[PDB]
Design a protein around this ligand. Structure first.
Ligand SMILES: CC(=O)NCc1ccc(-c2cccc([C@@H](C)NC(=O)c3cc(NC4CNC4)ccc3C)c2)s1
Ligand SMILES: [Zn+2]
Length: 316
């Protein structure tokens, strides 16, 4: 029969909108290629009357859109938008309650580790490079974290419903944050082999696997030396706003005011449950929407975060 149209906007970044005219007889797919509205796939759907003036997301099919996409997300992975939108379709349905003055996530689709990562980021000093993470993270801090979670999932190449590692998640995010000015100096000491000194910049300057205790890392930790005689690695100098100390879950006692926040993991490798412990006027345990408060804490801790500016050892 007749040809009806509506006006809509197409975007890759929801910053630069592009006025398009669509035909209400043809599917979005046929006219634009893959097309999303609020993360919902509409490729196979014909325009509705209500669609007038709404913003749709499309894949970058021309060079103008490729520049706009790369500038915003800092990636040229063709699958990225599809994944960002697939995630978003789920993450818009999650509830983000304000818990202890911080945005959490009400438990759903094994998001316990995203919730824990989100509560953590709010407590440490981080500047993201991708304008996509800068923007979503600002809105997350406000209670509006639907997009930030969908982006974490997209960057970390994760499915909705699949349980993630908080330390793997955080590493990925730190790869997309400005940490150029972060600097760590380690000394490794043997009885024979002598004192070797290394310097670590960026992600490797703020992350350590093998001890939870920041104080222990400064005193010294035992490591298997190449020679075969256990050597002592100790921290000589740290320049970072924070440090992340990680180790495989173990009964650990956390004391008020000796740490910033910690990741509790109960259960078995890849199928457990995450809780967030934070240190304020007392110890808070944030379990999605659920909050409890205690003087003391012992439990299976796997990540502890500490605030820092400049530490310099007095050793030697
Ligand atoms: C029987 C008993 O006493 N304890 C059981 C355990 C043995 C080992 C454990 C362990 C070891 C390391 C880390 C942990 C915790 C902190 N991490 C995860 O489980 C983990 C890992 C992955 N994906 C792998 C690819 N990137 C790592 C995905 C999701 C999760 C929750 C856990 S827990
Ligand atoms: Zn040695």
């Amino acid at each position: 029969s007749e040809v009806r149209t509506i006006k809509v906007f197409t975007t890759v970044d929801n910053i630069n909108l592009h006025t398009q005219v669509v035909d209400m007889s043809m599917t979005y797919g046929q006219q634009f290629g893959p097309t999303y509205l609020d993360g919902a796939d509409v490729t196979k759907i014909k325009p509705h009357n209500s669609h007038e003036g709404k913003t749709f997301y499309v894949l970058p099919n021309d060079d103008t859109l490729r520049v706009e996409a790369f500038e915003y997300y800092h990636t040229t992975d063709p699958s990225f938008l599809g994944r960002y939108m697939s995630a978003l379709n789920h993450t818009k349905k999650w509830k983000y309650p304000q818990v202890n003055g911080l945005t959490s996530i009400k438990w759903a689709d094994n998001n316990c580790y995203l919730a824990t990562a989100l509560l953590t980021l709010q407590q440490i000093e981080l500047k993201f490079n991708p304008p996509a993470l800068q923007d979503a993270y600002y809105r997350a801090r406000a209670g509006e974290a639907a997009n930030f979670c969908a982006l974490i999932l997209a960057y970390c190449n994760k499915t909705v419903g699949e349980l993630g590692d908080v330390r793997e998640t955080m590493s990925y995010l730190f790869q997309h944050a400005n940490l150029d000015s972060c600097k760590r100096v380690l000394n490794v000491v043997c009885k024979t082999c002598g004192q070797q000194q290394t310097t670590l910049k960026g992600v490797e300057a703020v992350m350590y696997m093998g001890t939870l205790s920041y104080e222990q890392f400064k005193k010294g930790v035992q490591i298997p030396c190449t020679c075969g005689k256990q050597a002592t690695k100790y921290l000589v100098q740290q320049e970072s706003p924070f440090v992340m100390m990680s180790a495989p879950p173990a009964q650990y006692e956390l004391k008020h005011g000796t740490f910033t926040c910690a990741s509790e993991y109960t259960g078995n490798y890849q199928c457990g449950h995450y809780k967030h412990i934070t240190s304020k006027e007392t110890l808070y345990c944030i379990d999605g929407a659920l909050l409890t408060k205690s003087s003391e804490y012992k439990g299976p801790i796997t990540d502890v975060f500490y605030k820092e500016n400049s530490y310099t050892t007095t050793i030697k």
